[PDB]
Structure 1
Amino acid sequence: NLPARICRDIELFHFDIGPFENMWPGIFVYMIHRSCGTSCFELEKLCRFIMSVKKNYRRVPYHNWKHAVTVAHCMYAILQNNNGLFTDLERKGLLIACLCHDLDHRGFSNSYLQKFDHPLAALYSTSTMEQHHFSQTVSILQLEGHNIFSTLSSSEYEQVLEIIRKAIIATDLALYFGNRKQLEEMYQTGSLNLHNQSHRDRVIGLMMTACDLCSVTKLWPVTKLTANDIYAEFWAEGDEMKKLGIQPIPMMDRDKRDEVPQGQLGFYNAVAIPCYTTLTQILPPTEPLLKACRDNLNQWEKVIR
């Protein structure tokens, strides 16, 4: 049962879920309750799903259980401040998608898996980890007593899984660049139509990027510390690249760590600011994400001087 400070602060886009792991499941239950109703999931079925999801996240520095819940929380905040736009089913699916969207991640990029010749890259040639993440989600749903969608009709079940599939695939950031370009064209020609399912999928995709990247929308101390965990995986990957005989990109090369601030500038200019700029144009109540993103861009510019 949620303490008062969290009942309040959880509505803030910049909420941080804290260091107490055992609290995160109740945090997610509360979010899904508040967004989708307490009559919607069988409580002990949902609990069991949640613990099995936790168990199939790995102890990696960043792509871990904490990241998953944090991304779900960003989605909760977007959904709360955009009442009436998304269906019951969409809100259920998106929150579950966010919880599940990095299942069984190793802390390595699709590119590294492809260079390594990992079996997953043979099985899923594109969006490799993201296809696996969705595969893991289904496997967990098929375990005895884990079908949190058991009361929905067959049709609604296939529907919500497809919502989840597309949302998890969309977290492959390689897809974001084209998606966002399409959406910005749509916005500026006044052609964006939320009743159009393909447009709607794009908007959900962008929301999934926004949540996945949300470390850059927290207050600076959180953003800065989260970047330590992000780079710990990047640098581990570049070491691994060095071990296959391949010179890693700078971002993954620990020997170029003094360039981290310049790198952050690059990322904010080319990815984060455009992402939340476009999201605020479509969903104006998401503006606090953009403002916090800009403040962090200013902090990184401060570090450089």
Structure 2
Amino acid sequence: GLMQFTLPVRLCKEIELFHFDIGPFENMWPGIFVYMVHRSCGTSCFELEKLCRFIMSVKKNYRRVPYHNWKHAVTVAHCMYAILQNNHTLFTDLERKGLLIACLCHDLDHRGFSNSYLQKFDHPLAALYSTSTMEQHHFSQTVSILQLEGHNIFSTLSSSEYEQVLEIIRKAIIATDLALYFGNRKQLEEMYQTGSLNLNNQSHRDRVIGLMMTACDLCSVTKLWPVTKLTANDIYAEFWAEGDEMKKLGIQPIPMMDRDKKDEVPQGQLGFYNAVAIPCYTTLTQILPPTEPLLKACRDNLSQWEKVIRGEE
């Protein structure tokens, strides 16, 4: 049990800031995760043998795609770690447990295509899960991995704690469906402004954990500008591949996905930040004030994209 994971000085200190980049050495990322779990959760909460075996099976089930890959999985888990460490006393044992696991698994087996594309293509996954298609698939992949031999990292929870944790995870993963985010943030904004928001109302915590999963998922926009700008090339690599594929079904795709409309990415990044990202981090900062660093970095990046449009870069 005294087998504590350690990090070099720069990473040890920078892992605590919201804007940490996990780096380009892929073989350090399992340890950055085990490090985050031990400090967030405790070192007795997972059997190290089972946790490492689970981590490796999860990484194996992330594909080689430009954005929705293993690096994204770990990067979303680091944002979650930073929210939990900045809000120590607000979450329970099972909640810290489930959520970091939910972040690592949340895009399991992503092929790099949206829900819209799966339904236009008439993929069999669209027949099985008529809404939040990929997200119900991600949760399914998580349960299968948890049921492999030697992978059940929750084995020592009681039947009731186990049911509670799977349920925290399923709801955390379903929430990453951005189609559900718009609704969820509006309701949190209405509860916040009327002062009815009650973190004892389980239905209310579920909404808050939802918004946290949006925040962690979009956190590439909260990075220092060189990291955000470079991650934007990976996201657009995927969008343009989907657009290519839309055109092979004979569907003209939305400007976001058309590689012939690269000129409009700067203006399209403004609307994304104004319609999705800025409100996300604003409402999250209203509910959890210590997550303010994410809104400040998200606004610095908007300014940077405004500066691109004015040809100052």
Shorter-chain TM range is over 0.9
Distance (whole Å) between structure 2 residues aligned to residue 230 and residue 185 of structure 1: 32
Deviation at 1:83, TM superposition (A): 1.0
Deviation at 1:9, TM superposition (A): 0.3
Distance (whole Å) between structure 1 residues aligned to residue 80 and residue 98 of structure 2: 11
| Counterpart residue number, 2:161 | 156
1:238-287 CA-to-partner distances (Å, cap 9, x unmatched) read: 00000000010110010111000000000000000000000000000000
Deviation at 1:205, TM superposition (A): 0.2
Deviation at 1:4, TM superposition (A): 1.5
Deviation at 1:176, TM superposition (A): 0.2
SS at match of 2:170: helix
Distance (whole Å) between structure 2 residues aligned to residue 153 and residue 192 of structure 1: 30
Distance (whole Å) between structure 1 residues aligned to residue 302 and residue 96 of structure 2: 30
| Counterpart residue number, 2:64 | 59
| Counterpart residue number, 1:173 | 178
Q: Compute the TM-score of the two structures, normalised by the length of structure 1.
A: 0.99
Say if 2:265 is the partner of 1:269: no
Deviation at 1:84, TM superposition (A): 0.6
Distance (whole Å) between structure 1 residues aligned to residue 93 and residue 184 of structure 2: 24
Deviation at 1:171, TM superposition (A): 0.1
Deviation at 1:3, TM superposition (A): 1.2
1:150-194 CA-to-partner distances (Å, cap 9, x unmatched) read: 111111111100000000000000000000000001111111111
1:93-124 CA-to-partner distances (Å, cap 9, x unmatched) read: 00000000000000000010000000000010
Distance (whole Å) between structure 2 residues aligned to residue 169 and residue 108 of structure 1: 17
SS at match of 2:282: helix
Distance (whole Å) between structure 1 residues aligned to residue 169 and residue 45 of structure 2: 17
Say if 2:285 is the partner of 1:280: yes
Q: Which moved more, 1:150-159 or 1:60-69?
A: 150-159
| Counterpart residue number, 1:91 | 96
| Runs of at least 4 residues off by over 6 Å | none
SS at match of 1:51: helix
Unaligned runs of 5+ in 2: 1-5
SS at match of 2:256: helix
1:12-33 CA-to-partner distances (Å, cap 9, x unmatched) read: 0000000011000000000000
1:108-155 CA-to-partner distances (Å, cap 9, x unmatched) read: 000100000000000100000000000000000000000000111111
Distance (whole Å) between structure 2 residues aligned to residue 102 and residue 40 of structure 1: 24
Distance (whole Å) between structure 2 residues aligned to residue 269 and residue 144 of structure 1: 46
Distance (whole Å) between structure 2 residues aligned to residue 207 and residue 303 of structure 1: 29
Q: CA RMSD in A?
A: 0.5
Distance (whole Å) between structure 1 residues aligned to residue 200 and residue 232 of structure 2: 37
Unaligned runs of 5+ in 1: none
Deviation at 1:5, TM superposition (A): 1.1
Deviation at 1:2, TM superposition (A): 1.6
SS at match of 2:64: coil
Distance (whole Å) between structure 2 residues aligned to residue 227 and residue 91 of structure 1: 29
Distance (whole Å) between structure 1 residues aligned to residue 200 and residue 159 of structure 2: 24
Deviation at 1:54, TM superposition (A): 0.1
Distance (whole Å) between structure 2 residues aligned to residue 157 and residue 227 of structure 1: 38
Distance (whole Å) between structure 2 residues aligned to residue 273 and residue 48 of structure 1: 37
Distance (whole Å) between structure 2 residues aligned to residue 154 and residue 196 of structure 1: 23
SS at match of 1:84: helix
SS at match of 1:62: coil
Deviation at 1:91, TM superposition (A): 0.7
Distance (whole Å) between structure 1 residues aligned to residue 9 and residue 56 of structure 2: 24
Deviation at 1:44, TM superposition (A): 0.7
Counterpart among 140, 155, 173 of residue 135 in structure 1:
140
SS at match of 2:230: helix
Counterpart among 195, 198, 204 of residue 199 in structure 1:
204
Deviation at 1:221, TM superposition (A): 0.4
